[PDB]
Design a binder for this molecule. Structure first.
Ligand SMILES: [Cl-]
Ligand SMILES: [Cl-]
Ligand SMILES: [K+]
Ligand SMILES: [Mg+2]
Ligand SMILES: [Mg+2]
Ligand SMILES: [Mg+2]
Ligand SMILES: [Mg+2]
Ligand SMILES: [Mg+2]
Ligand SMILES: [Mg+2]
Ligand SMILES: [Mg+2]
Ligand SMILES: [Mg+2]
Ligand SMILES: [Mg+2]
Ligand SMILES: [Mg+2]
Ligand code: NA
Ligand code: NA
Ligand code: NA
Ligand code: NA
Ligand code: NA
Ligand code: NA
Ligand code: NA
Ligand code: NA
Ligand code: NA
Ligand code: NA
Ligand code: NA
Ligand code: NA
Ligand SMILES: [Sr+2]
Ligand SMILES: [Sr+2]
Ligand SMILES: [Sr+2]
Ligand SMILES: [Sr+2]
Ligand SMILES: [Sr+2]
Ligand SMILES: [Sr+2]
Ligand SMILES: [Sr+2]
Ligand SMILES: [Sr+2]
Ligand SMILES: [Sr+2]
Ligand SMILES: [Sr+2]
Lengths: 46, 194, 56, 65, 81
RNA sequence: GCUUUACUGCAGGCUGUCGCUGAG
RNA sequence: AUACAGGGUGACAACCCCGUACUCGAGACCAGUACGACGUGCGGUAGUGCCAGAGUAGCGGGGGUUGGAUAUCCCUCGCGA
RNA sequence: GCACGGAGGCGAAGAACCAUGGAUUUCCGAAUGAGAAUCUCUAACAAUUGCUUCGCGCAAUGAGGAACCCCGAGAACUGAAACAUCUCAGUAUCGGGAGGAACAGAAAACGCAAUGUGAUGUCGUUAGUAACCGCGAGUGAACGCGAUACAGCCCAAACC
């Protein structure tokens, strides 16, 4: 496909969000990203 | 003594006789070539307009509107209906043509508010009414002792809520006693049975 | 050719996309109309009383 | 912190703008050192610079420049 | 008001461009044009920009590869930040 | 769902009449 | 104790803490209302057919609607003081 | 900040925090210079109106809001132990529109008929009464009265 600049920004955001919950948050909250996505198993919007 | 106005009034009691008859025969030829809503600088029936609140002042507008004659332009049922709800031809709308005229006029002038309207005749396929509209934002009107009332917020889009003289008549609000049990204070509060 | 699985492989057309006005993936890029908020169809926001139980 | 509201209001329009460019540069260099993963940082200032710039901008608006 | 230059893009590939092609790399505002990037750079480090190549990245930012004139030395320019 | 000289109605077509509509 | 409502505090707390009664303060609404004041000027007699809202009031054809039945309200076509 | 980490910082130049007021407030969005799946292209009240210095100069409209409210459009399942009038119901749903509430409202009223009442909502009652109806199933007021709250005015014309 051909992605517009805006589509690109959105894909970029989705990529960023798709990360682990920082280790330090674990400690601070004394004990998981529910929005973790996989390119294959999942399907983004658009 | 008789006012000059009384003469315009008396002429319009029989628009089919005398000079008026000849005028209408002439005028209508032009109206038929005009649009749906034509603003006009002067009311065709001065006496009537002044009587309904018209004034020769800034913020006061008059427009003639034509509407197709006849009953409801309804589409036949495309699903199951008991005989009672299959009618199409003899069914008529609940709003009279003068009301439809006032609404089209008011849509044309979104910033103005309907004051009143009156009939100016018809031919075999349409009817014409002139509608008096007021500019609630013009200072000449905001300062008018006889019209400033129409500047209040609750008067916005008054015609669309039936607050017009023609609106109130069509809603069965004329009578204050017998026969208005289901019209006053509103058709809706009375379950829509009026 | 079955209407099922074999016919599913021919589907690679993009229709519904992220809507500029509401943000839902409902802007039909062919019709240029959002099936969710009405963008492209009406200035007013798409809404219906059947979207909830009658007395609620 | 280091920069207070008084000091800012006591500056002339030209001084605020000069102070502005100066602050922006320190920030830019901070973000640069941060981009290089540099460690000789002081997390507080990078945060202070932002507020300082907001203060000067707020004052410039209040005074009319 | 948004600024043009956001920050230096420092990575192995960037270092090479700097050591072998006298090029500097920056993360810039995605609304900045090649020309606006050229100016900003000349006005921030006082050098002569010869060419600018841009790329809208999958990180949501715009990356600029700015080549300096032979009269300037990227290695040294970058070494003062 | 379908049919027809089932019951009852509804569009639609034809036709008269009234309005549009005037002069000798 | 005019305070024995409720909560908190390492277990059943009026007296450990927040509060609670009493008293007090501010905002909002009531309301640009009530009162008050400015200006205006109420009313009555005799005479005068000078004025007082038309497709209206009313009637008929066709519909809808209503508890509205001969006696509901409305639309439509025609007629019409 | 949620959030009980590490590092670092701020606070007696009185921070945090709270109240009131102000500043900043990207892009799309009624979305309004043109176009576009939130971006792009070359000065903008687009469009419809009022006024008009007839120039977008001054203004209005647009869209939103839980329901409530006003004006229009308007079913069927269902009940009648079938079913067509009737019923479900002017309900569901649809179109348009206003406000903080709407709508109504100072009698061409009522008609306990009177030597009587006196704008209008609403509440209680009048009453499942009068009235309607394959006179079947079912539908169903009003005047009055007791209350709540109370408020009465402005034009057209005559004459100028
Ligand atoms: Cl209006
Ligand atoms: Cl009485
Ligand atoms: K039925
Ligand atoms: Mg990665
Ligand atoms: Mg007067
Ligand atoms: Mg009501
Ligand atoms: Mg490129
Ligand atoms: Mg735009
Ligand atoms: Mg049955
Ligand atoms: Mg019925
Ligand atoms: Mg039976
Ligand atoms: Mg009923
Ligand atoms: Mg009665
Ligand atoms: Na996928
Ligand atoms: Na209007
Ligand atoms: Na960056
Ligand atoms: Na079947
Ligand atoms: Na009725
Ligand atoms: Na009739
Ligand atoms: Na804000
Ligand atoms: Na405007
Ligand atoms: Na203009
Ligand atoms: Na049955
Ligand atoms: Na049956
Ligand atoms: Na019946
Ligand atoms: Sr798959
Ligand atoms: Sr409006
Ligand atoms: Sr085949
Ligand atoms: Sr196959
Ligand atoms: Sr395909
Ligand atoms: Sr469209
Ligand atoms: Sr809707
Ligand atoms: Sr990356
Ligand atoms: Sr009169
Ligand atoms: Sr009273």
């Amino acid at each position: 496909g051909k992605k517009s600049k805006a589509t690109k920004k959105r894909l970029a955001k989705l990529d960023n969000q798709n990360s682990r919950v920082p280790a330090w948050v674990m400690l601070k909250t004394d004990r998981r990203n529910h929005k973790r996505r996989h390119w294959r198993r999942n399907d983004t919007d658009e | 003594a008789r006012s000059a106005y009384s003469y315009i009034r008396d002429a319009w009691e029989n628009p089919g006789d005398g000079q008026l008859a000849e005028l209408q025969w002439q005028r209508q030829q032009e109206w038929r070539n005009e649009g749906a809503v034509e603003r006009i600088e002067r009311p065709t029936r001065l006496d009537k307009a002044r009587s309904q609140g018209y004034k020769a002042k800034q913020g006061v507008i008059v427009a003639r509107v034509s509407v197709r004659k006849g009953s409801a332009r309804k589409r036949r049922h495309k699903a199951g209906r008991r005989s009672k709800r299959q009618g199409v031809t003899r069914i008529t709308r609940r709003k009279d043509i003068q009301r439809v005229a006032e609404e089209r006029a008011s849509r044309t002038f979104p910033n103005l508010r309907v004051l009143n309207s009156y009939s100016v005749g018809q031919d075999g396929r349409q009817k014409w009414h002139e509608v008096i509209l007021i500019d609630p934002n013009h200072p000449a009107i905001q300062n008018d002792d006889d019209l400033s009332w129409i500047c209040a917020d609750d008067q916005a889009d008054r015609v669309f809520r039936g607050l017009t003289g023609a609106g109130r008549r069509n809603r069965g609000l004329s009578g204050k006693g017998k026969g208005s049990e289901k019209t006053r204070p509103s058709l809706r509060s009375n379950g829509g049975k009026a | 050719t079955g209407a099922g699985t074999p016919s599913q492989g021919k589907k690679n057309t993009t229709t519904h996309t992220k809507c500029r006005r509401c943000g839902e993936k409902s802007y039909h890029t062919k019709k240029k109309v959002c099936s969710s908020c009405g963008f492209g169809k009406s200035a007013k926001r798409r809404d219906y009383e059947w979207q909830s139980k009658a007395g609620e | 912190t280091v920069l207070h509201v008084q000091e800012i209001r006591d500056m002339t329009p030209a001084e605020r703008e000069a102070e502005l460019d100066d602050l922006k540069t320190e920030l830019l260099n901070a973000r640069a050192v941060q981009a290089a993963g540099g460690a000789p940082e002081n997390p507080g200032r990078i945060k202070e610079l932002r507020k300082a710039i907001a203060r000067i901008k707020t004052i410039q608006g209040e005074e009319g420049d | 008001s948004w600024d043009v230059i956001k920050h230096p893009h420092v990575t192995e590939k960037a270092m090479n461009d700097m050591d072998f092609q006298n090029k500097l790399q920056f993360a810039v505002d995605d609304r900045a044009s090649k020309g606006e990037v050229a100016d900003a750079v000349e006005e921030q480090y006082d050098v002569t920009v010869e060419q600018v190549n841009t790329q809208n990245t999958m990180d949501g930012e715009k990356k600029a590869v700015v080549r300096l004139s032979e009269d300037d030395d990227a290695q040294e320019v970058a070494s003062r930040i």
